[PDB]
């Protein structure tokens, strides 16, 4: 957590100064640690996404409809 | 659960649980300290409030939203309303072994049949094929069979044609109002990707070939296909159970040719002569020697019986047109010529079918109607039948009439300026005079559209019905109404403000003269209200429909005779005008309460 | 005249002279965004308004503050195109200037303490194209102007919701741009009431006591005073004479020594007249006449200090005496007549519980913060900040001005906050209109409704972001050090950009542009809705807003709006419309002068026209003098009638003002009903651009306008001469007239080849020009996908008939030839997109290479070794594009296949397949590939192939560009070096380069030497700069996701042509489905042997009143009745002047049409190419209501040697006979739609399912399964069936054992059933057992 907090405090400054979002290599070498850990932190950080979110622009569809049970069986395979 | 991008989705319910736990055990921290009861109290409050949020969030008061700036789902919300489990996944179901597509017209059909694209039924009837392929020994097992399907050899198509035989189908138009929104058919198949479909049943669907599409299901097992072959098949369903009339009215082209064929003109040729039978009549029409509409004395055979169902051979002569003689050539042996010396508008053809049903029943009736459709299309084609600018008629007495109405309204304008009549008086006057003026114009034009044919033909001048297309459309009953044809030639009466309130100065022109901006501008809001309230009759319809059914979902017959005593009396409805419904016809189909008899008593 | 005019001319029949030319179509989007972003010194719109609003920003208490200065936009990184490619937004960044300002609050104002100027980045901002789109992630996206309730103050009244009462209930409302609301209203029982922000009803006077008013002040301002007088004996009074009007006398209302009106008697107008004339204002009366009045204010016997009377207290006679001895000769009192003067406020005061300011403030605080106790300063700051704080309340001064209008003020302006006087005035007007005086207003009158366009929304979310920031900066300022704290570090930039990006990309306004046809584009830009924020909702709506108001005329089209629920909400715009500086609409009108038509114009709003009178366009003006006849169709105040000539003020301009464009291009609309025309317009946008661009003959004249101003196609910005041409692109040169001096002076125009839409359709530009030919500015140079010669064209023109045919056109269906599909002339093209992905995983990265196990190696044949197909390859479902592979785990098994691998031995490796493939049933052809790859990661072999390929392609593009530039520049080096003496023939043969060093001359030749030296320096400068810059533009990696390593894209194509089941229609609502094709032979044919293309059913005409189409048909034929003739004259090949005379006679055919033509003007060559273009017909323009008439076409068909009727004589083809009577025939313009049989068909047998519920899913692309609702079951059990729906519910949806078992039964030739009990029922059981329920099941 505190690594993330540190990192974001840094990147704010980096996008002050560069007029841009920063590159992982740049703020990593400023943060004194290799790109792999940064990249994994970024892979890990974001939260879940609320099954009942309306992918439908209106209430025509929820997200929980358009997935599949890719675990169970198949009848032709049983035969 | 993840998706492919790696992100986990989360049922918001999880949140509702997790917070609960922590507070509980947080309380057990403070309880293990015997801290002041104040913190204890507010934590109890929080717990109660959280359970409330779990069980129904939008109920107690302050509604919880999550990160999304959106409220969360309690448990109840999976049970409430339309999104709940009942009418979303316990009654309104998704189904396997189905499909859908666009519809189109099969006119060469027999109405117990239907059109069908190949590949649809191919994949639908797939495991059937796998099984009998194993049975025949071409594909030893399933993988090989599936590959051969993907390979598409002629043996596959042959086997398809084998399996479709006897194997029925079932359709569904969207939406389903009355139970004849789905009928069982038999498959016949087309090198296309749309469905051909017999025309007459469109009215039972109310479907218009303007981009509609419909759905296909299949009776897998045995009893299913029995019920389909017995009950929802169209031949077993011709009369509405709401009212004992047919739903096999032939609509608008068939009837047109039938009218054109049976007609009492005189113009062409062959008048005043004789034949021995209808066959040489159609013969000589194909040779180009006499019209269909041409009146003639000929031979006729016919049959009857009030016997013990034993027909009464009969033969004589009749004055008649030719086309009526041809049209005799298909009636199945129980109906006289008296049916067919008319010009055959809609009500006739309906009555013909009703007669064939009462006197014979089902098979001969359907055979008859199918031949009706055939012959009607075929002879309407031979017509030549079109529309143009000159078929529309402008009565020359359309300008002066306007001028006198103009002068009248000017008169009463000066009168109300003097201040003698009132606003409502002026108003009533003006509306009455313009309405009568439109009546006068409609009179003129219909008197110059219907029977103006002065065709000298072994006479000097005889008046007969007009050969113009749109009047034949009108009197036939297929499409059109005197108001509408008035509205093509005459001016459009008057139209009102969207309040129900209404205008002073009416319209004064038609289409063929060409509207002007204001008149079109004014017709706008009328049309808008029309399609507007058309849009949403259906909400109320469906809603009260659910109410109706879920009252009466449960009842059923269980018994023949209750053994009880009398109930109701029924009497006619003769008040307000003449009779509107007989005692005779409403009691029809009912039973008798009691010993009754006739005013000649003891009968 | 122009050039493309001369290449082909369309005919007119419009006689009504024009005075206005059509404007640019979509100036409004441009102007809105322009004024938003653009600077403003004083006339605040845009950014500066928000900055000045929220800045400056002091510290938490005062020491430090920030001082806005100004801003700067910045150039973008990329261009438009690569942003379209890279899947990346287009935008420009933002910089701002800030200043720290600290002042020694230890001192009084020690300002010079420290200052730090610094600039700050915060936020990127997207941008508007020259057309009007934005772009995000490779998506042209559009937002739509909104339409809502203006601010200010409104009045209205309801028709006795206590229908018990059946009486009017007035009420009144205020509306700011921002903040809180109010609502004043009457109850049935004659009392005022008030509510903030739809809170509880409360009385009104509490607000006045809250505003530090006293009861005496209240009654002083509201009422007009009835004053008594005692003189020790008797009551006198002072009566305004017009106070008995509509009343009856109580006592003998009598003159000074004389009577006027007896008791119970009508006080006529003459009695009041005589009192007015007899100048009497002292009337002697009884004292008990007082009984009923109210005291104005408490008058006491001030000798005592005792309340003898409280204010608002019904008078008496004991108190009469009691104050008689007080010394008071009168106490002023009030008037009350229920007829004219409403005392409602006073009886309300009698129920006013409070007396003090403080209790009122308490109750307000209470209603708005229940449960909490009162504290003074809290409620006070609350009351004042709800209405008197500039931050929490704003009007957006359109409110202010119309507020001043509705109060009949002279003033215009002020603030976005309140006075008190405003409130008294509005209450006063309410009680007046409750007395009856004045009138209520309506909502639909456009003077009370306002647009809201892009820049405004943008300002809104921009400032709320600013507010998100200033909260923190308040937190940060006063706390830390105050000399070291830079201005910058107190800012975060995420919130502003967050709100802006989520608005431009997640609202319900940012919609994907529709690239069907240019019409779709521009009409989607010229939309208006009334949904979304500050707006409407269908359940909150009825019909009065759906419907039409008389004021739409000239501002909005009443036609063009769809058929679903969204009926009257959205509204496409009118044509010559403009909006107003305050944001209202207005429209052009010609003005009149003494019967003379003032040829200049004015834009008039929704209101002033209601004051004026107005004339129409049909008015046949009498040629520059006056108007012909006295009576003239005019309108005013909502309705129309016939008026004089001198009484008129204004007249309309053209006969198109009311409509939208889509409802304008339709010809002979006048002869058509409204609803079918609506349908035809909304049908005229789901179309497709055809393979070729076949033109429509007829038209209106508004085709090239939209063609141009859609910007889909190229056009010249400088006149000049061609220099090079190609299918891919052109090159132009400019003249000397438009010649900027410093430049080389050439334009250039590359093109857009085959390119996906958002709707998966082809897009292409091609020239319609040639070589060595001149140009003027504005001239088109190439044609988009649906254009020809800069005239719009969607569909094609086709031969028809009108008859039944064996049932194949039963209900409005269609029947066609095979001649068409073999001309491939409704054929169309459909691009499709695909994708694969390489990611990093738990184990290792997904790799990509050709070599994969368990592969049909023939499939590998198509690929390179990277695992990738080549270009131009044909493809089908099941085939492979890309070979992707995935690191594997380890696999658990069964004894059977275990034994099998004991037999054979061979295995899988420790990697599996994830290869992309063509979906089932789809086929096509590849034409493109693309790769996007990370930075720092190795670009593999094929990555380098496409990368050095695109480097070579673009270096070549710039080779061409820079070479022709520098070649134009080398025009110097001949005329300049051959100068300075001369060595011409001796110069020329030698190498070009060693000409600097020859015979050297006086000083300005050395000047020449230095100049050319700098020139050859600039040479390699240019080369270096451009080439290197874009080389390492291209060379880099990409900005993309986590987990990913690279991607691969594919853009392939398919050539789709016609089937049955496909939709088409025409321009009059004449829909049509296809029933079959037929061979040419079976079809009809005329006597001369020309068969016919399609056929259809004429019954649909009267029913639908889609008349004009048949009329169009007649005219259609006449076109080729000329056109055909010409080709004879073309190959007959007789002479120029013959056909010159001929077609000149053709254009001059009509009677009194306003265009003209003179062909002594032209050459012979112009004429010949014109005729070469017209040999297929003679296109026509029929305006909408200055249309042509049947007389003209009848004449024109006499000219074309053809029948007057259009009826002609036909033959069957299947049997050779003749039809018993003629038929109407001609050509009409038709077109197909975006509803394709393969884009609608789908079927299913078995596959995927859900997981929570385990029932098959829905969606064609998703392998849908069809739905079976609750009405179908009602139908079934009506038929008396049980087994069908039993098996339907159990197995084909939910039961698991049953579905599996029966699959394996029916494959074993057994049609048998074995149901279960569904899952969802048990789900319900678990869900209710969650709730404390002991539901269960009882055994039999």
Chain C residues whose CB is inside 8 A of the B189 CB are: none
Q: Does C1307 touch chain A (CB under 8 A)?
A: yes
- The Cα-based distances of C142 to B124, C71, C529, C1322 in angstroms read 43, 27, 13, 47
Chain C residues whose CB is inside 8 A of the B132 CB are: 1309
What letters, b where the CB count within 10 A reaches 16 and e where it falls short, cover B30-40?
eeeeeeeeeee
Q: Does C963 touch chain B (CB under 8 A)?
A: no
Please report which residue ranges of B297-422 form alpha helices under DSSP H.
Answer: 322-327, 346-359, 363-383, 400-418
SS3 of C1099, please?
Answer: coil
* Contacts of residue C570, Cβ cutoff 8 Å, sequence gap at least 6: C527, C528, C529, C530, C531, C561, C562
Closest-approach residue (CA) in chain B for C1101: B387
CA A67 to chain C, closest CA, distance in angstroms equals 7
Q: Does C565 touch chain B (CB under 8 A)?
A: yes
Q: What's the token pair of residue B452?
A: 């103006």
Q: Taking CB atoms and an 8 Å limit, are A46 and B68 in contact across chains? A: no
Q: Are C643 and C634 in contact (CB under 8 A)?
A: yes
* Contacts of residue B246, Cβ cutoff 8 Å, sequence gap at least 6: B238, B239, B240, B350, B353, B354, B357
Q: Are C1170 and C9 in contact (CB under 8 A)?
A: yes
| Residues β-bridged to residue B187 | B114
Q: Alpha carbon C1246 to chain centroid distance?
A: 43
Q: Does B384 touch chain C (CB under 8 A)?
A: yes
Chain A residues whose CB is inside 8 A of the B11 CB are: 51-52
Cis peptide before C1135 (omega within 30 of 0): no
**Of the candidates C874, C880, C876, which has an alpha carbon nearest to the alpha carbon of residue C859?**
C880
Q: Give the whole-angstrom CA distance, residue B557 versus residue B412.
A: 69
Chain B residues whose CB is inside 8 A of the A47 CB are: 67
Query: How many Cβ atoms are within 10 Å of C538's Cβ, its own excluded?
Result: 13
Q: Are C863 and C871 in contact (CB under 8 A)?
A: no
Using DSSP, how many helices (H) and how many strands (E) does chain B show?
A: 20, 11
Q: What's the token pair of residue B194?
A: 């749309």
Q: Are C178 and C343 in contact (CB under 8 A)?
A: no
Query: How many Cβ atoms are within 10 Å of C1084's Cβ, its own excluded?
Result: 19
Give the method of determination: cryo-EM
What letters, b where the CB count within 10 A reaches 16 and e where it falls short, cover B75-98?
bbbbeeeebebbeebbebbbbbbb
Q: What's the token pair of residue B215?
A: 């759905």
Give the phi and the psi of residue C840 in degrees, each rounded to 5: -100, 145
Q: What's the token pair of residue A78?
A: 């049983």
Chain C residues whose CB is inside 8 A of the A71 CB are: 1251
Closest-approach residue (CA) in chain A for C1308: A79
Beta strands in C168-307 (DSSP E): 168-175, 182-186, 192-195, 225-230, 235-237, 253-255, 258-261, 283-285
Helix, strand, coil proportions of chain B in percent (round to 5)? 45, 10, 45
Cis peptide before B175 (omega within 30 of 0): yes
On the 0-12 / 13-18 / 19+ scale of CB atoms within 10 A, B558 is: exposed
Q: Give the whole-angstrom CA distance, residue C567 versus residue B513.
A: 30
Neighbours of C (≥3 Cβ pairs closer than 8 A)? A, B
Q: Does C412 touch chain B (CB under 8 A)?
A: no
Instruction: Classify strands B170-172 and B213-217 as parallel, antiparallel or unpaired.
Output: antiparallel
* Contacts of residue C84, Cβ cutoff 8 Å, sequence gap at least 6: C135, C138
Chain A residues whose CB is inside 8 A of the C1300 CB are: 73, 75, 78
**Of the candidates C324, C332, C326, C319, which has an alpha carbon nearest to the alpha carbon of residue C303?**
C326
Which residue in the set A16, A43, A72 is minimally distant from C1043, CB to CB?
A: A43
CA C121 to chain A, closest CA, distance in angstroms equals 6
Instruction: Give A 36-75 residues with CB within 8 A of chain B.
Output: 43, 46-53, 59, 63-64, 67
Q: Are B450 and B259 in contact (CB under 8 A)?
A: no
Angle at C22 between CA C18 and CA C25, to 5 degrees: 165
Resolution as reported, in Å: 3.9
Please report which residue ranges of B240-342 form alpha helices under DSSP H.
Answer: 254-261, 278-287, 322-327
Q: Taking CB atoms and an 8 Å limit, are C1099 and B179 in contact across chains? A: no
| Residues β-bridged to residue C1227 | C799
Q: Residue holding tokens 């027999």?
A: B110
Q: Does B194 touch chain C (CB under 8 A)?
A: yes
Q: Taking CB atoms and an 8 Å limit, are C1307 and B142 in contact across chains? A: yes
Please report which residue ranges of C1150-1282 form alpha helices under DSSP H.
Answer: 1164-1174, 1190-1199, 1271-1279
Q: Which helix (H) or strand (E) holds B37?
A: helix B37-55
Max alpha carbon distance in chain B (Å)?
123
Beta strands in C1173-1268 (DSSP E): 1180-1181, 1207-1208, 1210-1211, 1223-1224, 1227-1232, 1242-1244, 1266-1268
CA B73 to chain A, closest CA, distance in angstroms equals 9
Beta strands in C441-595 (DSSP E): 449-452, 511-512, 578-579, 585-593
Beta strands in C539-595 (DSSP E): 578-579, 585-593
Q: Taking CB atoms and an 8 Å limit, are B93 and C1293 in contact across chains? A: yes
Beta strands in C1057-1200 (DSSP E): 1063-1066, 1071-1078, 1085-1086, 1094-1095, 1180-1181
Q: Are B486 and B511 in contact (CB under 8 A)?
A: no
SS3 of C204, please?
Answer: coil
Annotated binding site of B for Zn(2+): 562
Query: How many Cβ atoms are within 10 Å of C927's Cβ, its own excluded?
Result: 15
Please report which residue ranges of C408-517 form alpha helices under DSSP H.
Answer: 421-435, 454-476, 494-506
* Residue of A13, A38, A67 to mutate, interface with C, max C Cβ within 10 Å: A67
On the 0-12 / 13-18 / 19+ scale of CB atoms within 10 A, C1176 is: middle
- The Cα-based distances of C274 to C249, C260, C279, C340 in angstroms read 16, 9, 8, 21
Q: Taking CB atoms and an 8 Å limit, are C1303 and A65 in contact across chains? A: no
Q: Are C147 and C451 in contact (CB under 8 A)?
A: yes
| CATH class (in words) of the domain with range B398-537 | mainly alpha
* Contacts of residue B289, Cβ cutoff 8 Å, sequence gap at least 6: B269, B270
CA A43 to chain C, closest CA, distance in angstroms equals 6
Q: Give the whole-angstrom CA distance, residue C311 versus residue C355.
A: 11
Q: Are B233 and B149 in contact (CB under 8 A)?
A: no
Angle at B231 between CA B241 and CA B350, to 5 degrees: 45
Q: Are C64 and C482 in contact (CB under 8 A)?
A: yes
């Amino acid at each position: 957590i505190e690594t993330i907090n540190k990192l974001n405090r840094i990147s704010r400054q980096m996008l002050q100064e560069m007029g841009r979002e920063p590159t992982p290599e740049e703020l990593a070498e400023r943060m004194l640690m290799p790109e792999d850990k940064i990249r994994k932190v970024l892979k890990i950080a974001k939260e879940p996404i609320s099954m009942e979110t309306p992918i439908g622009d209106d209430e025509d569809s929820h997200l929980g409809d358009f997935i599949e049970d890719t675990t169970l069986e198949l009848p032709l395979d049983s035969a | 659960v993840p998706l492919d991008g790696g992100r986990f989705a989360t049922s918001d319910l999880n949140d509702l649980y997790r917070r609960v736990i922590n507070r509980n055990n947080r309380l057990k921290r403070l309880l293990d300290l015997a801290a002041p009861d104040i913190i204890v109290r507010n934590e109890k409050r929080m717990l109660q409030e959280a359970v409330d949020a779990l069980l129904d969030n939008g109920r107690r008061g302050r509604a919880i939203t999550g990160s999304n700036k959106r409220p969360l789902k309690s448990l109840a919300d999976m049970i409430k309303g339309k999104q709940g489990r009942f009418r979303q996944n316990l009654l309104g179901k998704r189904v396997d072994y189905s499909g859908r597509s666009v519809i189109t017209v099969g006119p060469y059909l027999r109405l117990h049949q239907c059109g069908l694209p190949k590949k649809m039924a191919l994949e639908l009837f797939k495991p059937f094929i796998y099984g009998k392929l194993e049975l025949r020994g071409l594909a030893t097992t399933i993988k090989a069979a599936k590959k051969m399907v993907e390979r598409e050899e002629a043996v596959v198509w042959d086997i398809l044609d084998e399996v479709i035989r006897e194997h029925p189908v079932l359709l569904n138009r969207a939406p389903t109002l009355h139970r004849l929104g789905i009928q069982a058919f038999e498959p016949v198949l087309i090198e296309g990707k749309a469905i051909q479909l017999h025309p007459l049943v469109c009215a039972a669907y109310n479907a218009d070939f303007d981009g509609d599409q419909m759905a296909v299901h299949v009776p897998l097992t045995l009893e299913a296909q029995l019920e389909a072959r017995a009950l929802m098949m169209s031949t077993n369903n011709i009369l509405s159970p709401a009212n004992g009339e047919p739903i096999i009215v032939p609509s608008q082209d068939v009837v047109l040719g039938l009218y054109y064929m049976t007609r009492d003109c005189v113009n062409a040729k062959g008048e005043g002569m004789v034949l021995t039978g209808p066959k040489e009549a159609e013969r000589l029409y194909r040779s180009g020697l006499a019209s269909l509409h041409a009146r003639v004395k000929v031979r006729i055979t016919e049959y009857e019986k009030d016997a013990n169902g034993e027909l009464v051979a009969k033969t004589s002569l009749k004055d008649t047109t030719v086309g009526r003689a041809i049209l005799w050539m298909i009636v199945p042996k129980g109906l006289p010529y008296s049916i067919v010396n008319q010009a055959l508008g809609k009500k006739a053809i309906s009555k013909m079918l009703n007669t064939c049903y009462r006197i014979l029943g089902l098979k001969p009736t359907v055979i008859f109607a199918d031949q009706i459709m055939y012959t009607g299309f075929a002879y309407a084609a031979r017509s030549g039948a079109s529309v143009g600018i000159d078929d529309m008629v402008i009565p020359e007495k359309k300008h002066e009439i306007i001028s006198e109405a103009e002068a009248e309204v000017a008169e009463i304008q000066e009168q109300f300026q003097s201040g003698l009549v009132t606003a409502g008086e002026r108003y009533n006057k003006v509306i009455d005079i313009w309405a009568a003026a439109n009546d006068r114009v409609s009179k003129a034009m219909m008197d110059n559209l219907q029977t103006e044919t002065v065709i000298n033909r072994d006479g000097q001048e005889e008046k007969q019905v007009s050969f113009n297309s749109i009047y034949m459309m009108a009197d036939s009953g297929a499409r059109g109404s005197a108001a509408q044809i008035r509205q093509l030639a005459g001016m459009r009466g008057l139209m009102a403000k969207p309040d129900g309130s209404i205008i002073e100065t009416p319209i004064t022109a038609n289409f063929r003269e060409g509207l002007n901006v204001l008149q079109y501008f004014i017709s706008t809001h009328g049309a808008r209200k029309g399609l507007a309230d058309t849009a949403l009759k259906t909400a109320n319809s469906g809603y009260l429909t659910r109410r109706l059914v879920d009252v009466a979902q449960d009842l059923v017959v269980t018994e023949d005779d209750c053994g009880t005593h009398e109930g109701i009396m029924m009497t006619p409805v003769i008040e307000g005008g003449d009779v509107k419904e007989p005692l005779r016809d409403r009691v029809l189909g009912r039973v008798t309460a009691e010993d009754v008899l006739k005013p000649g008593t003891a009968d | 005249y122009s050039y493309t005019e001369k290449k082909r001319i369309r005919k007119d029949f419009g006689k009504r002279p024009q005075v206005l030319d059509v404007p640019y179509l979509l100036s409004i989007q441009l102007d809105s965004f322009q004024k938003f972003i653009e600077q403003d010194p004083e006339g605040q719109y845009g950014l500066e308004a928000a900055f000045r609003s929220v800045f400056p920003i002091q510290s938490y208490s005062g020491n430090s503050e920030l001082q806005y200065v100004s801003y700067r936009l910045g150039e973008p990184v990329f261009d438009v195109q690569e942003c379209q490619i890279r899947g990346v937004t287009y935008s420009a960044p933002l910089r701002v200037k800030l200043r720290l300002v600290i002042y020694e609050r230890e001192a009084p104002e020690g300002t010079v303490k420290d200052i730090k100027e610094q600039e700050v980045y915060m936020g990127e901002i997207p941008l508007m194209t020259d057309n009007g789109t934005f772009v995000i992630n490779g998506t042209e996206r559009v937002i739509v102007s909104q339409l809502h309730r203006s601010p200010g103050v409104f009045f209205d009244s309801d028709k006795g919701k206590t229908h018990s009462s059946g009486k009017v209930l007035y009420n009144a409302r205020i509306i700011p741009y921002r903040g809180s609301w109010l609502d004043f209203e009457f109850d049935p029982k004659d009392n005022l009431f008030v509510r903030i922000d739809r809170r509880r009803k409360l009385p009104a006077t509490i607000i006045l006591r809250a505003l530090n008013y006293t009861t005496e002040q209240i009654l002083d301002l509201f009422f007009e005073k009835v004053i008594f007088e005692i003189r020790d004996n008797k009551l006198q009074m002072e009566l305004v004479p017009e106070r008995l009007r509509g009343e009856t006398a109580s006592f003998d209302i009598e003159a000074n020594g004389k009577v006027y009106v007896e008791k119970g008697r009508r006080i006529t107008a003459r009695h009041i007249r005589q009192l007015e004339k007899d100048d009497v204002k002292l009337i002697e009366v009884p004292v008990e006449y007082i009984a009923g009045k109210v005291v104005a204010k408490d008058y006491i016997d001030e000798s005592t200090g005792e309340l003898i009377c409280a204010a608002n207290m019904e008078l008496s006679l004991d108190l009469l005496a009691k104050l008689s001895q007080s010394g008071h000769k009168r106490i002023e009192t009030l008037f009350t007549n229920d007829l004219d003067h409403g005392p409602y406020i006073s009886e309300t005061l009698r129920v006013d519980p409070t007396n003090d300011r403080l209790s009122a403030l308490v109750e307000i605080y209470r209603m708005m913060r229940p449960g909490e106790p009162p504290t003074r300063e809290a409620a006070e700051s609350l009351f004042e900040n709800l209405f008197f704080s500039e931050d929490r309340y704003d009007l957006s001064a359109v409110g202010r001005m119309k507020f001043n209008r509705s109060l009949l003020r002279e003033e215009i302006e002020g603030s976005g906050i309140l006075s008190k006087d405003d409130i008294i005035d509005v209450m006063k007007k309410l009680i007046d209109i409750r007395n009856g005086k004045g009138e209520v207003d309506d909502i639909d009158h456009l003077g009370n409704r306002r647009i809201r366009s892009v820049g405004e929304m943008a300002e809104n979310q921009f400032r709320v972001g600013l507010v998100r920031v200033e909260r923190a900066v308040k937190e940060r300022l006063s706390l830390g050090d105050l000399d070291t704290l830079m201005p910058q570090d107190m800012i975060n930039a995420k919130p502003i950009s967050a709100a802006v990006k989520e608005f431009f990309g997640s609202s319900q306004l940012s919609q994907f542009m529709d690239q069907n046809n240019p019409l779709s584009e521009i009409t989607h830009k010229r939309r208006i809705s009334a949904l979304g924020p500050g707006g409407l909702t269908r359940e909150r709506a009825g019909f009065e807003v759906r419907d039409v108001h008389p004021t739409h005329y000239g501002r909005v089209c009443p036609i063009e709006t769809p058929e679903g629920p969204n009926i009257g909400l959205i509204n496409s715009l009118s044509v010559y419309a403009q909006t107003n500086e305050y944001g209202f609409l207005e429209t052009p009108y010609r003005k009149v002068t003494d019967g003379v038509v003032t040829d200049e114009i004015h834009y008039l709003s929704a209101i002033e026209e209601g004051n004026y009178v107005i004339a129409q366009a049909n008015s046949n003006l009498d040629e520059e003098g006056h108007f012909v006849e006295d009576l003239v169709t005019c309108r005013s105040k909502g309705e129309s009638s016939l008026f004089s000539r001198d009484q008129v003020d204004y007249m309309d301009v053209s006969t198109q003002q009311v409509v939208s464009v889509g409802a304008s291009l339709i010809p002979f609309l006048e002869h058509d009903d409204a609803n079918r025309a609506l349908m035809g317009a909304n049908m005229q946008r789901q179309a497709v651009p055809t393979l070729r661009a076949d033109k429509p003959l007829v038209g209106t004249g508004m085709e090239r306008a939209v063609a141009v101003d859609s910007g889909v196609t190229a056009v010249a910005k400088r006149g000049g001469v061609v220099q090079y041409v190609d299918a891919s692109r052109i090159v132009i040169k400019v003249n000397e007239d438009e010649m900027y001096p410093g430049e080389a002076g050439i334009d250039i125009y590359n093109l857009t080849k085959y390119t996906r839409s958002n709707q998966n359709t082809c897009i292409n530009q091609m020239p319609c020009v040639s070589l060595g030919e001149p140009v003027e500015r504005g001239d088109v140079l190439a044609d988009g996908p649906s254009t020809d010669l800069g005239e719009l064209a969607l569909g094609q023109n086709m031969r028809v008939a009108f008859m039944p045919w064996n049932g194949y056109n039963f209900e409005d269906s269609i029947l066609v030839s095979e001649r068409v599909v073999q001309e491939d002339r409704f054929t169309t093209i459909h691009i499709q997109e695909l994708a694969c992905v390489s990611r990093d995983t738990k184990l290792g990265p997904e790799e990509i290479t050709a070599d994969i196990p368990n592969v049909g190696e023939a499939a590998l044949s198509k690929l390179d070794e990277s695992g990738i197909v080549y270009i131009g390859a044909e493809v089908t479902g099941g085939d492979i594009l890309v070979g992707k592979v995935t690191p594997k785990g380890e696999t658990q098994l069964t004894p059977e296949e275990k034994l099998l691998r004991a037999i054979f031995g061979e295995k899988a490796s420790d990697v599996k397949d994830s290869s992309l493939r063509v979906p089932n049933g789809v086929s096509g052809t590849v034409i493109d590939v693309q790769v996007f790859t990370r930075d720092g990661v190795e670009k593999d072999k094929r990555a380098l192939e496409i990368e050095e390929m695109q480097l070579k392609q673009a270096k070549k593009d710039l080779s061409e560009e820079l070479q022709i530039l520098e070649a134009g520049l080398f025009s110097r080096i001949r005329a300049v070096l051959v100068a300075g003496g001369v060595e011409a023939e001796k110069l020329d043969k030698l190498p070009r380069d060693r000409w600097l060093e020859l015979g050297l001359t006086d000083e300005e030749k050395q000047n020449q030497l230095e100049q050319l030296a700098e020139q050859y320096d600039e040479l390699k400068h240019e080369f270096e700069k451009k080439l290197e810059a874009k080389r390492r533009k291209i060379t880099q990696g990409d900005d993309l996701a986590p987990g990913v390593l690279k991607i691969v894209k594919v853009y392939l194509a398919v050539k789709r042509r016609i089937q049955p089941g496909d939709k088409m229609a025409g321009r009059h609502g004449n829909k049509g489905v296809i029933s079959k094709i037929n061979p040419i032979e079976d079809m009809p044919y005329d006597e001369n042997g020309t068969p016919v293309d399609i056929v259809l059913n004429p019954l649909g005409v009267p029913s639908r009143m889609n008349i004009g189409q048949i009329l169009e048909t007649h005219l259609g034929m006449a076109a080729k009745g000329i056109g055909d003739k010409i080709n004879a004259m073309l190959k007959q090949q007789q002479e120029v002047a013959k056909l010159r005379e001929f077609i000149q006679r053709a254009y001059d055919l009509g009677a009194d049409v306003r265009q003209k033509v003179d062909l002594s003007t032209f050459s012979d060559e112009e004429v010949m190419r014109l005729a070469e273009n017209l040999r297929k017909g003679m296109p026509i323009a029929t305006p909408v209501f200055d249309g042509a008439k049947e007389a003209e076409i009848k004449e024109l068909l006499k000219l074309g040697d053809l029948p007057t009727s259009g009826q002609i004589r036909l033959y069957d083809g299947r049997t050779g006979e003749q039809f018993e009577r003629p038929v109407t025939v001609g050509y009409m313009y038709m077109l197909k739609l975006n509803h394709l049989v393969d884009d609608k068909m789908h079927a299913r047998s078995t596959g995927s399912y859900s997981l929570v519920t385990q029932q098959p899913l829905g969606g064609k692309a998703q392998f849908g399964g069809q739905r079976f609702g609750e009405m179908e079951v009602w139908a079934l059990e009506a038929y008396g069936a049980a087994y069908t729906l039993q098996e339907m519910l159990t197995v084909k949806s939910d039961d698991v054992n049953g579905r599996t078992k029966m699959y394996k039964n029916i494959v074993d030739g057994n049609h048998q059933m074995e149901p279960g009990m569904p899952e969802s029922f048990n789900v319900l059981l678990k869900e209710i057992r969650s709730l404390g329920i002991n539901i269960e099941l009882e055994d039999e």
